Amino acid sequence: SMSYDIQAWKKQCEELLNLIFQCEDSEPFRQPVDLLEYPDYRDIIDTPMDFATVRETLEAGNYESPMELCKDVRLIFSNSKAYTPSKRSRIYSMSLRLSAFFEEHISSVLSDYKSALRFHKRN
Numbered sequence: 001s002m003s004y005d006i007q008a009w010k011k012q013c014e015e016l017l018n019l020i021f022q023c024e025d026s027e028p029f030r031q032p033v034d035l036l037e038y039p040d041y042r043d044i045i046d047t048p049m050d051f052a053t054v055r056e057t058l059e060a061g062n063y064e065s066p067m068e069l070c071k072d073v074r075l076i077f078s079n080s081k082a083y084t085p086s087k088r089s090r091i092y093s094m095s096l097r098l099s100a101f102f103e104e105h106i107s108s109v110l111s112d113y114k115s116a117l118r119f120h121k122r123n
């Protein structure tokens with residue numbers, strides 16, 4: 001059961017998403033971009049992603065691992081870097097700060113999960 005629990009990441013990710021939604025820096029990234037308020041968005045971005053979509057995908061049980069969730073979160077930030085490439089932009093700075101916060105906190109979730117996997121595979 002509790003040591004090396006291969007399902008513990010789910011609640012840990014739910015908690016991290018709660019922290020992210022609290023952050024003022026997540027405001028531009030909470031919901032899908034409105035494709036009529038920004039009609040050139042899809043000209044630039046192939047695969048839109050936002051934190052409400054990540055949170056619903058997790059709730060629906062559609063991530064097989066925390067690495068899958070992490071891929072979608074990283075897409076939020078890589079899409080922002082493509083759409084708002086200027087380091088002058090306060091939106092660029094927001095994305096950088098929130099990315100760094102996410103990467104700090106996801107680190108232990110991933111390493112713990114992979115350790116659990118290695119242990120169960122070995123035994």
Ligand SMILES: N#Cc1nc(Cc2ccccc2)oc1N
Pocket residue numbers: 028029033038080083084089091092
């Ligand atoms: N001002 C401003 C601005 N407004 C957008 C739209 C946006 C923002 C965040 C994520 C996705 C899309 O980019 C900018 N640089």
